[PDB]
Amino acid sequence: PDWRPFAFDPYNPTGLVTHHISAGIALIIGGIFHTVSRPSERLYNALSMGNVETVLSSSVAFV
Amino acid sequence: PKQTWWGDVLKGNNNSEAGKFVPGWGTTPVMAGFVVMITLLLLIMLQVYNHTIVLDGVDAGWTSLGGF
Amino acid sequence: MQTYGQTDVEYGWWSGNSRFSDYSGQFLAAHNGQIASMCFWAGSFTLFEVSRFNPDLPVYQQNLVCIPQLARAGWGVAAGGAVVDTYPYFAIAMIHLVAAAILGAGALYGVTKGPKVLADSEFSGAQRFHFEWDDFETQGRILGHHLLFLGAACLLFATWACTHGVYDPVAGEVRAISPSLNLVRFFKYGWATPGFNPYFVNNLEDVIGGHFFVSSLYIAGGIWHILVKPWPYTDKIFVKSGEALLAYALAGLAFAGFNAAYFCSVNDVVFPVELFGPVLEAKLNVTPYFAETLDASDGGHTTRFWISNFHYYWAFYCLQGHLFHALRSYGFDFRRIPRALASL
Amino acid sequence: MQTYGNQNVEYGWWSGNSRFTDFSAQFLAAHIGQIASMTFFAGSITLFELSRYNPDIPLYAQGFVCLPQLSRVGFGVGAGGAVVDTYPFFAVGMIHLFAAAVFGSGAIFHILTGPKVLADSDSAASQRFHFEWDDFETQGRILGHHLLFLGSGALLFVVWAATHGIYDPNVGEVRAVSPGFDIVRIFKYGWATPGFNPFFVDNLEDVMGGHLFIALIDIAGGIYHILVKPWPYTERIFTKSGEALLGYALGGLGLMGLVAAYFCSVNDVVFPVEFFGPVLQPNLGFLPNFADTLDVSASGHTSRFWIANFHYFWGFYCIQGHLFHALRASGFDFRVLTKFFTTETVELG
Amino acid sequence: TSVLSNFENEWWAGNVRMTDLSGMLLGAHLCHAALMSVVPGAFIVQEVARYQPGVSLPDQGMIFMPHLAALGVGVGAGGEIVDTYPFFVIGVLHFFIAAVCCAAGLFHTFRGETDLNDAPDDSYAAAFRYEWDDFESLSTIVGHHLVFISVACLIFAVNATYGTGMYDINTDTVHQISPNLNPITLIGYLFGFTPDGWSGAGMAAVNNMEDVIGGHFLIGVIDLLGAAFHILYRKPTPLFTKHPVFSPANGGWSNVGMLNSELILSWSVASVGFMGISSSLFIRYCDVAYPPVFHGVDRTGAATLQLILGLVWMLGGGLWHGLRGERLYAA
Numbered sequence A: 001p002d003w004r005p006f007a008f009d010p011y012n013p014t015g016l017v018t019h020h021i022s023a024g025i026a027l028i029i030g031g032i033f034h035t036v037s038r039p040s041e042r043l044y045n046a047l048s049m050g051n052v053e054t055v056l057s058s059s060v061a062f063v
Numbered sequence B: 001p002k003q004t005w006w007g008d009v010l011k012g013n014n015n016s017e018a019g020k021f022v023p024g025w026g027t028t029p030v031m032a033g034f035v036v037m038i039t040l041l042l043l044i045m046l047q048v049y050n051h052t053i054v055l056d057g058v059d060a061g062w063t064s065l066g067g068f
Numbered sequence C: 001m002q003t004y005g006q007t008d009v010e011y012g013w014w015s016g017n018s019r020f021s022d023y024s025g026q027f028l029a030a031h032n033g034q035i036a037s038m039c040f041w042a043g044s045f046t047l048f049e050v051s052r053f054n055p056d057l058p059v060y061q062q063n064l065v066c067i068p069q070l071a072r073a074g075w076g077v078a079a080g081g082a083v084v085d086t087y088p089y090f091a092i093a094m095i096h097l098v099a100a101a102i103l104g105a106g107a108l109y110g111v112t113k114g115p116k117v118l119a120d121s122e123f124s125g126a127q128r129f130h131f132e133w134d135d136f137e138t139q140g141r142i143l144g145h146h147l148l149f150l151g152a153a154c155l156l157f158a159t160w161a162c163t164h165g166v167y168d169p170v171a172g173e174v175r176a177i178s179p180s181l182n183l184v185r186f187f188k189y190g191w192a193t194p195g196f197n198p199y200f201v202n203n204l205e206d207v208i209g210g211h212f213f214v215s216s217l218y219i220a221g222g223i224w225h226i227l228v229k230p231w232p233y234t235d236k237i238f239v240k241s242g243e244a245l246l247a248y249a250l251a252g253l254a255f256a257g258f259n260a261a262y263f264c265s266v267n268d269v270v271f272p273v274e275l276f277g278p279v280l281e282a283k284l285n286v287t288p289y290f291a292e293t294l295d296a297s298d299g300g301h302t303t304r305f306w307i308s309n310f311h312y313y314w315a316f317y318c319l320q321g322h323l324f325h326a327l328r329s330y331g332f333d334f335r336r337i338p339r340a341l342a343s344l
Numbered sequence D: 001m002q003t004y005g006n007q008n009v010e011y012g013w014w015s016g017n018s019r020f021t022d023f024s025a026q027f028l029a030a031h032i033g034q035i036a037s038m039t040f041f042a043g044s045i046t047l048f049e050l051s052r053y054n055p056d057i058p059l060y061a062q063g064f065v066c067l068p069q070l071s072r073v074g075f076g077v078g079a080g081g082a083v084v085d086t087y088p089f090f091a092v093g094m095i096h097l098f099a100a101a102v103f104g105s106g107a108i109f110h111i112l113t114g115p116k117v118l119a120d121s122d123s124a125a126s127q128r129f130h131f132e133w134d135d136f137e138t139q140g141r142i143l144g145h146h147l148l149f150l151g152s153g154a155l156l157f158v159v160w161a162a163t164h165g166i167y168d169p170n171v172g173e174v175r176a177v178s179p180g181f182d183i184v185r186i187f188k189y190g191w192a193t194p195g196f197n198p199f200f201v202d203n204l205e206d207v208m209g210g211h212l213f214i215a216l217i218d219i220a221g222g223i224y225h226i227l228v229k230p231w232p233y234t235e236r237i238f239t240k241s242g243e244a245l246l247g248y249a250l251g252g253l254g255l256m257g258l259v260a261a262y263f264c265s266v267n268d269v270v271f272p273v274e275f276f277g278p279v280l281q282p283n284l285g286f287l288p289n290f291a292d293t294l295d296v297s298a299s300g301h302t303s304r305f306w307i308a309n310f311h312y313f314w315g316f317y318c319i320q321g322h323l324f325h326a327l328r329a330s331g332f333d334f335r336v337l338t339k340f341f342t343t344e345t346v347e348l349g
Numbered sequence E: 001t002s003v004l005s006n007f008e009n010e011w012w013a014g015n016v017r018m019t020d021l022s023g024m025l026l027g028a029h030l031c032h033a034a035l036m037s038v039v040p041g042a043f044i045v046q047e048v049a050r051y052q053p054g055v056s057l058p059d060q061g062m063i064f065m066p067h068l069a070a071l072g073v074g075v076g077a078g079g080e081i082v083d084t085y086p087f088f089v090i091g092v093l094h095f096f097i098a099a100v101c102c103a104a105g106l107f108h109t110f111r112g113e114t115d116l117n118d119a120p121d122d123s124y125a126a127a128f129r130y131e132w133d134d135f136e137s138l139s140t141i142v143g144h145h146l147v148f149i150s151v152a153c154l155i156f157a158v159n160a161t162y163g164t165g166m167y168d169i170n171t172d173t174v175h176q177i178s179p180n181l182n183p184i185t186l187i188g189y190l191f192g193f194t195p196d197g198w199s200g201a202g203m204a205a206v207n208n209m210e211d212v213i214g215g216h217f218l219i220g221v222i223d224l225l226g227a228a229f230h231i232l233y234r235k236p237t238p239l240f241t242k243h244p245v246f247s248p249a250n251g252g253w254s255n256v257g258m259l260n261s262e263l264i265l266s267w268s269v270a271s272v273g274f275m276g277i278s279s280s281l282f283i284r285y286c287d288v289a290y291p292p293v294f295h296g297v298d299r300t301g302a303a304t305l306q307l308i309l310g311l312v313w314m315l316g317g318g319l320w321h322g323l324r325g326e327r328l329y330a331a
């Protein structure tokens, strides 16, 4: 892996590793935060986080 | 309602804080920044893939495979 | 131990040693056991290496740590850095094993028949040796005696080098070395003046002169601490608990270990190449390590590599333990880490 | 015994030999029986080896522990370590068997003669032999007598080497040996100064002088212990119980076993090559071994190999048993080990 | 905690909780300095590990070695790196500084008293009591920090002039260059009045080491004098008090000259952003201080990086904290 800008060239494989390392870490932090932090009333009511259907909607869009 | 061992291990993660939220906006402002950040990141990548942006010494094509 | 406020602390088996922190007899016993195990390792692996030794291959490319160090102090190497005989190695190992047995006997005694608390012993010669974690006056004399032993060992090494002689890589054989000693020189080394970088000593005469100076320093300090109480300001500065002294000792050990690891990595007069191998290069990545100037393929790794790399991490984690025990002695509770998240 | 706190402990049959720790007559009987077993081993094994002896095969190649030991101490060995006459070995084994029968008869005699305790027996002179696990005066006298016997044995060895001769691999034939006497050289072997290493003794003269010294020391110590009660500090240091004395003896025996094990593998004089085989070399992997230093192909192992390894293990486990018995006699009960994975402290006296 | 915007007690804003806690704040700054000093030494050691002798520095992608080589460290005639050990020494010494700073930060966060207002009444530590309202207290802080910065600048200049000098771009090697001390000539650069005519990039068109070294001497002397000024007086003057400021605290210009924690922070942040932009211009144009023998010729990327940082600090941070401080002046 190399963090120099040419790792963003999609045809150079050195990006992929550089991605999955850094992004991997980004998810771990992103995991830890969500494993601890609570939502916000505003967002919680807006997105209806108590209802699994919202998870379905967002996941389908992501996929 | 079987009281299994694994259920004892995992019930705290399942629904200890079920239905709890902090009032107001909380961390939502900070989230905003993150979104904008990635909105640049992805955008940049797209243009780099699109050859709109040409980074120095970064030839976005099959020639960049040189070195393997 | 810290035991923030609470008394009658329950320690799980995984943290078991803390239980005996408040008994002096068991404390002594445990430390006799520790030094016994160190001595046992020394002797046992002298024998182990001798058992896996070929007088044909290069010494350093064979995985060895005790034979090269014994050779560096004479004892089996004549010239050109080749081990001729092996029996003095066996004799040294046997003496180390016997000393280990004696020390372990002392430890086992302290556990069973020795007094759990020295002050409560009837002998009243044992009540002399009792100590308390808050009394710097007694710990001063303990420190003084231990410094005396350290300085005596350093002086003994000096005299053995002078009279019997140690390896001289510049000379290429075992030589009796006269001490080239001058205070101005040693302050030049201390200030790292351009001709004098203390990690690049070139003449063992300077090494042994430094050892004479260091032995004098240790003996002077030992007598000083046996005779002179700590000053009142020390009570203001330092903390008074066992964990605090553990933190100070861990800091000192980390400092010593970093110096030793770097010394092994870069010097080649104290560590002759024919014994320990070529010099190493420091290399930083996500974590530091020392790498071989010569190729490590076909030769595994040299003795110098193992010694310096091991002691770097010994020193690093000793530093981490120093921080841990310092914070513990500061009353900081680590139960705050899995508690803060709960509050958030 | 120990009986932590609670007396009148009940022992299973697996640990059933601790039942007679307080019955002096039965104690005597057990130990006479054990000594009978030892001497019976010596004689019977001598005959068992003689049965399959091959003059063609070198002595150490075949599996022996007794023919080399006899051939070393004179007893029908020709020049160049040749077993000329195989009758003296038969005579030695036979005398050992007769002695074993005598000892076993005495053992059964005491196991059935009178009371279990030697205090009650109305012999009025066997009561001179009843001992205690607390009194150090009687045990000092006992120690003195046994040391007398050991010194008398060393003296007998000195005399037999002086008159009958003894094998000398350096000479190459059985030869009388002058008993040396040089306290200076004895102490120089004590220090292991570079000239003299105790495990590399080269001249049987030095061995004979050391044996003369040992005999003198043992006899003097025996006299001293018979006459003189132990000093008070020896009551301060040592506990007074049977298991404690067993622990002391076990530690001593473990040390002696390790010393003899190292002696076998290295010294060539007192363990001649033609009888026991070429010297071994000490290896240390997980546990110490003695490598044969010879191709075991079509030759098995030399007798020196077997002796050295067996006695290394005997010494090591005698040390472990010494630790066990000393730990008990000092007061430590091992049941507390079961409390290891709990929060209760794994510790007592 | 001395603020009531809407979200004072939020964990993601928790640093504001140390607004008045002097001891904890001192510890936090010390730990931060530990970070700032760990990075250079660590990355210098990492760089020296992979340094190759034949290839030149601009083609190796080193971002700390060029600045060290610019000072004559481990280089000889012709501007080629000869010995790499002094870079390693610099890295190690930064490790030492970082360790000392981290030790101090740990002490003041946990062992030391949280609030110096709770110090034991002239115990060598009440002398360090400061308050975000009284001017006199903070004046001596500014004075002493100016002392340290001035001594650093003077040391740099003195080294350049007398001891071992610097790598002079024109003379092609390391030399003790004779300083230029024509004060009008030096201060002309601040308006672009370079000798070769007015130039767009102020202070950045210096074409000789003598100008820069003379400027450093001038700056050191000026900062030493200002340090004396602030340490020895500590009293507000009609420059700070009674100056025009425009703020919705009172709609329109006012001569109040208000003082507040967020305001001090905002002025400092704006200053840092401004230094960032000035350094952007410097590395863009001034190649006397950045010999392209080391930093390469094309240097638009580094200048742009500096520009972005300077804008973030000067505009973003400065505005945010200034507005918060002015609003908090409604107490």
Ligand code: CL7
Pocket: C014, C015, C016, C017, C018, C246, C250, C317, C318, C319, C320, C321, C322, C324, D340
């Ligand atoms: C790694 C950083 C570190 C260093 C180097 C360090 N400590 Mg600690 N350290 C101590 C001494 C110490 C000394 C003398 C010392 C100097 O060398 C150090 N430390 C140094 C003790 C006073 C104190 C408690 C020490 C204590 O009880 O340590 C025991 C800990 C461990 C992991 C043993 C597990 C190791 C083996 C792999 C597993 C063995 C299993 C076994 C084979 C099976 C059963 C066999 C049986 C049936 C026969 C201590 C602590 C503790 C910690 C932590 C986190 C540390 N440390 C850390 C360090 C406690 O929780 C802990 C603490 O205080 O929490 C309350």
Ligand SMILES: CC1=C(/C=C/C(C)=C/C=C/C(C)=C/C=C/C=C(C)/C=C/C=C(C)/C=C/C2=C[C@H](C)[C@H](O)CC2(C)C)C(C)(C)C[C@@H](O)C1
Pocket: C186, C189, C190, C198, C201, C206, C207, C208, C209, C210, C211, C213, C214, C237, C255
């Ligand atoms: C200020 C402070 C403190 C202090 C904190 C610290 C960090 C204390 C640290 C003390 C240290 C690190 C002392 C280190 C001393 C190093 C010495 C004395 C080096 C000695 C080397 C000698 C004497 C000779 C060595 C050779 C001898 C050797 C044989 C070779 O021939 C080479 C040759 C000639 C270099 C406290 C703890 C008191 C209070 C804190 O709160 C703050």
Ligand SMILES: CC1=C(/C=C/C(C)=C/C=C/C(C)=C/C=C/C=C(C)/C=C/C=C(C)/C=C/C2=C[C@H](C)[C@H](O)CC2(C)C)C(C)(C)C[C@@H](O)C1
Pocket: D185, D186, D189, D190, D198, D201, D206, D207, D208, D209, D210, D211, D213, D214, D237
């Ligand atoms: C110190 C102490 C204790 C320990 C006490 C102990 C266990 C002390 C240990 C004592 C030992 C190990 C004594 C060993 C003595 C060894 C002797 C006397 C060796 C004699 C060997 C001789 C004479 C050899 C003779 C030849 C034999 C042989 C032929 C050689 O080729 C040559 C020649 C002729 C020299 C405690 C633990 C019990 C109590 C503590 O509080 C105090």
Ligand SMILES: CC1=C(/C=C/C(C)=C/C=C/C(C)=C/C=C/C=C(C)/C=C/C=C(C)/C=C/C2=C[C@H](C)[C@H](O)CC2(C)C)C(C)(C)C[C@@H](O)C1
Pocket: E186, E187, E189, E190, E203, E206, E211, E212, E213, E214, E215, E216, E218, E219, E243, E244, E245
């Ligand atoms: C107080 C005030 C305010 C603020 C006003 C502002 C923004 C004031 C700005 C103040 C500044 C920017 C002061 C900075 C002055 C910079 C100086 C004095 C720099 C000197 C540098 C020198 C002399 C170095 C010179 C060299 C030295 C250097 C080493 C190089 O070799 C180049 C070379 C040789 C030119 C408001 C906004 C609140 C209200 C206003 O009305 C008044």
